[PDB]
Design a binder for this molecule. Structure first.
Ligand SMILES: Nc1nc2c(ncn2[C@@H]2O[C@H](COP(=O)(O)OP(=O)(O)O)[C@@H](O)[C@H]2O)c(=O)[nH]1
Lengths: 199, 181
């Protein structure tokens, strides 16, 4: 309700959003009529990127699995032809937000090979997952490395699971069980969580 | 004890079962008494050696790398998979399979448990570093070959009793089961 549009958006000949209306209306038009949902998303982005520059609010763009934008799609036409990511309006409008042509906010993203298309299981580095086009788009950027648990973090996570009584095996609270879990997971948070799930 | 036929050979005289039993009983009685020197070499004349001590695992020599770190190399084979492992005397529990971390090279937990089995059996998880190269076979065959290689290389840094415990646990025997025609 505080954020308001600066243009007249025409959903159809009968319905339009007038200048100065709250942004929520636009969202509502996307939530009520799905036909205009995709058009409603882009407008929101178009507004949020612009108004944040004016200084009305601070904007955070949190995109998880950002590598999808500059890759390949598994969506097909009716002629069984491949569709490129840029041919999707939802993907096309979200690329404009990743460009550093606006101020008043920060862009944070996380890579992900899980659910990625046409990538090997062991690819995790920025260029390998992003592609040349993705690296060129994001460049310049600050990469931040996320690693496996160090011994302090591993011990604290196991203590958290024990405090929640989530390790029911009698040998789990002992020290030998902790060494075995450490070796089996290699301090990987996801493998440790999955192993502790059924113990 | 000296068997009947070679007792006959020593005596150069044919003898029966019962008199052989009587002689063995007398020898046992002599052993029971406080045998002095002449007695126990006399008995040793009639006792052969059981040279079937299967505790003959070959302990790999300890080598030293250019950095001065001590290590041991060994080989292993399971089905068509063939592995060669280098185990370092000191380490933090890091295993590198073909230059890849073991949890990345072996997604399946079963293979990781197989890689655990040797070190866990002798209570030195997290005390060694392993650099192994495996080729051929499949996931389970490669895991088994690497397990055998690491056990044979780890024999160098453990006691003889622990080597025997590993042998009795089946950690030092090549699996001979392969596909049949
Ligand atoms: N239904 C509707 N959608 C609009 C309208 N204006 C912008 N949009 C959508 O909101 C997005 C804003 O992105 P934009 O700045 O216009 O980039 P452009 O598509 O290349 O022209 C567009 O991609 C449209 O999908 C409008 O007047 N009516």
């Amino acid at each position: 309700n505080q954020i308001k549009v600066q243009e007249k958006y025409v959903w159809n000949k009968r319905e339009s959003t007038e200048k100065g209306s709250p942004l929520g209306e636009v969202v509502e038009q996307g939530i009520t009529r799905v036909r205009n949902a995709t058009d409603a998303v882009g407008i929101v982005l178009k507004e949020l990127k612009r108004q944040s520059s004016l200084g009305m609010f601070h904007l955070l763009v949190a995109v998880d699995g950002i590598n999808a934008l500059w890759g390949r799609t598994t969506l097909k036409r009716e002629d069984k032809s491949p569709i490129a990511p840029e041919e999707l309006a939802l993907v096309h409008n979200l690329r404009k937000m990743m460009k550093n042509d606006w101020h008043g906010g920060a862009i944070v993203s996380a890579l992900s090979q899980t659910g990625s298309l046409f990538k090997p299981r062991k690819a995790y580095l920025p260029q390998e997952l992003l592609g040349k086009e993705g690296f060129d788009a994001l460049d310049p950027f600050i990469p931040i490395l996320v690693s496996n648990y160090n011994p302090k973090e591993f011990e604290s996570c196991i203590q958290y699971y024990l405090e929640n009584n989530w390790l029911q095996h009698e040998k789990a609270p002992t020290e030998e069980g902790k060494k075995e879990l450490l070796f089996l997971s290699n301090a990987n948070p996801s493998l440790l969580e999955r192993h502790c799930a059924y113990l | 004890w000296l068997i009947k036929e070679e007792l006959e050979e020593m005596l150069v005289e044919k003898l029966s079962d019962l008199d052989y039993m009587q002689f063995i009983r007398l020898l046992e009685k002599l052993l029971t008494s406080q045998c002095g020197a002449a007695e126990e070499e006399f008995v040793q004349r009639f006792r052969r050696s059981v040279t079937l001590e299967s505790k003959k695992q070959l302990i790999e020599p300890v080598q030293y790398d250019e950095q001065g770190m001590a290590f041991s190399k060994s080989e292993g084979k399971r089905k068509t998979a063939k592995a060669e492992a280098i185990v370092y005397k000191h380490g933090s529990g890091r295993i590198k399979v073909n230059g890849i971390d073991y949890q990345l090279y072996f997604p399946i937990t079963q293979d990781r448990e197989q890689l655990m089995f040797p070190f866990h059996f002798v209570d030195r998880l997290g005390k060694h570093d392993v650099t192994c190269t495996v080729s051929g076979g499949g996931r389970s065959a490669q895991a088994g070959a690497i397990r055998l290689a690491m056990a044979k290389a780890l024999c160098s840094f453990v006691t003889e009793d622990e080597v025997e415990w590993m042998r009795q646990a089946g950690l030092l025997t090549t699996d001979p089961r392969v596909r049949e025609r």
